[PDB]
């Protein structure tokens, strides 16, 4: 019903060449392009096209950027080739999901991020200190709803499954990788918001969570405790960017790939159908990319020191 885009934008790669004309129809020679202009070109073009698609579909959207490590399954390589074409690598990643996204960031980096990224930027703290929330995932017959719960566990919000229309993966040697996505939420049908508010999803007991959801109403496949701190920046031209810092610890898990505390930083915005007509999404995308690159460069040293993920070929 709608096209979707997948991109693996590895940094420090320049797949393009400048076509420099030389005087003596036309004639030219090839020259080395800049280090990473092509990445920004692809990101901006795909963002603009998919945002146009959304606008013609009067669908809301969100530009979601998070920081973590993208670990490829060892089965991605064929015939044991260390070096492979980027186009082939992307077409291989798309076919069967060999990629594994791990949103994380070292604990000690928080002060450095606040002093050298949040404070120098227009980013200012908002909200009321730190808010504790429970993020849960309810699988159903044909859909996978998401639910937010307060300290008591009451149903704060019910949301439909995120649909990703554009999924980019900025990848860096030393620093944490950056995943950039454009997401949409098909409207929750109204009964569901009611259905899940009345029925107690979870039953708190001395800070221990036991599922009490009626089994016919899906299963609580995923559940986690979240400590959320919000920062916001409303720059000129009426575009807002939000830094959500989440200390997340899962409680009820389905698979053994998500079982540890994790610190996540997410840059988010909004692309309303009406606003996007008068909004240059080019600037929003470029600003998000630049901010992500700056923070990745800031935290690269401590990410390497604490996690040791240094991809050297």
């Amino acid at each position: 019903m709608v096209p979707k885009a997948f991109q693996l934008l590895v940094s420090d790669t320049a797949p393009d060449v400048v076509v420099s004309r030389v005087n003596t129809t036309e004639c030219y020679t090839l020259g080395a392009s800049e280090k990473d202009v092509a990445i920004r070109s692809r990101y901006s073009k795909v963002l603009q096209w998919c945002c146009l698609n959304m606008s013609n579909l009067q669908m809301d959207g969100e530009l979601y950027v998070d920081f973590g490590k993208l670990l490829l399954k060892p089965s991605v390589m064929r015939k044991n080739r260390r070096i492979v074409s980027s186009y082939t690598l992307q077409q291989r990643l798309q076919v069967n999901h060999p990629y594994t996204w791990v949103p994380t960031l070292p604990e000690s980096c928080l002060s450095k991020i606040q002093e050298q990224f949040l404070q120098p930027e227009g980013f200012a703290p908002i909200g009321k200190g730190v808010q504790l929330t429970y993020s849960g995932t309810i699988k159903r017959s044909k859909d996978q709803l998401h639910v937010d719960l307060d300290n008591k566990g009451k149903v704060l919000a019910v949301n439909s499954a995120w649909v990703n229309l554009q999924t980019a993966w900025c990848t860096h040697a030393k620093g944490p990788d950056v995943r950039l996505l454009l997401r949409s939420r098909p409207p929750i049908r109204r009964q569901d918001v009611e259905l899940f508010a009345s029925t107690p999803i979870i039953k708190l007991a001395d800070d221990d969570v036991a599922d009490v959801l009626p089994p016919e109403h899906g299963q609580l496949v995923y559940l986690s405790e979240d400590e959320t701190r919000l920062f916001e920046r409303v720059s000129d031209r009426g575009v807002t960017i939000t830094v959500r810092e989440v200390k997340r610890q899962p409680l009820i898990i389905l698979r053994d790939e998500e079982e540890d505390p994790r610190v996540e930083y997410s840059l988010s915005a909004h692309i309303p159908a009406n606003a996007a007509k008068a909004t240059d999404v080019r600037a929003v995308g470029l600003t998000a990319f630049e901010l992500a690159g700056r923070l990745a460069g800031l935290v690269a040293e401590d990410f390497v020191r604490e996690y040791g993920c240094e991809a050297k070929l």
């Binding site: 096209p3 979707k4 885009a5 997948f6 693996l8 590895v10 940094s11 420090d12 790669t13 320049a14 797949p15 393009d16 060449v17 400048v18 076509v19 129809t25 036309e26 004639c27 030219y28 020679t29 090839l30 080395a32 392009s33 202009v37 092509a38 795909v46 096209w49 490590k69 993208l70 670990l71 490829l72 399954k73 060892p74 991605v76 390589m77 260390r82 070096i83 492979v84 074409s85 980027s86 186009y87 082939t88 690598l89 077409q91 291989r92 076919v95 594994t100 994380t104 990848t171 860096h172 040697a173 990788d177 790939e257 998500e258 540890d260 994790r262 996690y307 991809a311 050297k312 070929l313």
Partner: protein, 341 residues
Amino acid sequence: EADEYGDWGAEPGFEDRRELDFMELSPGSPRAFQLLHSETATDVGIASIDPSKLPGQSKVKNALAAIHVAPNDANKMRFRMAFEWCLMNIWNMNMPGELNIGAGKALYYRSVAKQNRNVMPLWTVQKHLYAQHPYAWFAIASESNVAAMESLAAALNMSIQQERTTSYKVTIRRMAEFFDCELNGQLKCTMMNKPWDRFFVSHYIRSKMPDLRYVVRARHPIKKRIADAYLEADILRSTRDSVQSVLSPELGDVVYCCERVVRKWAKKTATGVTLQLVETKRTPLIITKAGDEGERLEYEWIVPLPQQAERIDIAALTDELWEYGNKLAAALEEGMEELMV
């Protein structure tokens, strides 16, 4: 169009279309074309990483993360793949062949000034350059390049072998069929090969002025009676001014001529392969093409294609050939700056 990148989904059967990613062939004028660059590398390196301390990944002790590759290694790997492919094709045929590394500059041309995008990735450029073959190689050198190449040969312990031998090259056309011919200096008919068929051409575009081109070419077998008749027959008379054709009665007309001062430095490489350094000072003499005129000095590597039975180390041979081509380019570079097209 807009799908020139790996976006907008996964089109089915990508491995079939992208199996020959390192080059560009259109199955049934070189058949095989690849374009390289000294600072551009579409290749991405899949390294080995240790995600022992990640959250959620404490049992997996090995994972893969994509990173950038130095363009030297990516070009090495692409050239090795293309060379292995062309070697496989040659060995499938009975063709004997050779790989020549020539020096010069490559110039292209756009069909129409409109719809010309300033910055494109390599593969679409390769597609455009192989669609109608809109390119031209200009082999250039200087007199200082003579001393530079002499010093390079002395450093590489090259053998002197041939010195300043003079020969000629001519082409005879019957119907549209074309014959290449090599003649000895004293108007002696020497060798009657068929024109070179290049199965693989690589435009390795360096950053600086000197530019390297690797070409793998083979000769079809020559049918006996025509070549034998050509051997004894006098084809090229020489007046005191220049050469002239006396081959009319039983041959098609001559189209091209040339005089070659040839200087060959040969040596055995690290592996069991013999390589040559050919210095060719060519004077066009009689020509029919509007661009051939002008004396041209060329420096080339020439390596005969090793046979299948010899079973030479292909990877090491490719590494040595790339290293020697880079050495040639580096030696020629300091002398080659004044051209500026």
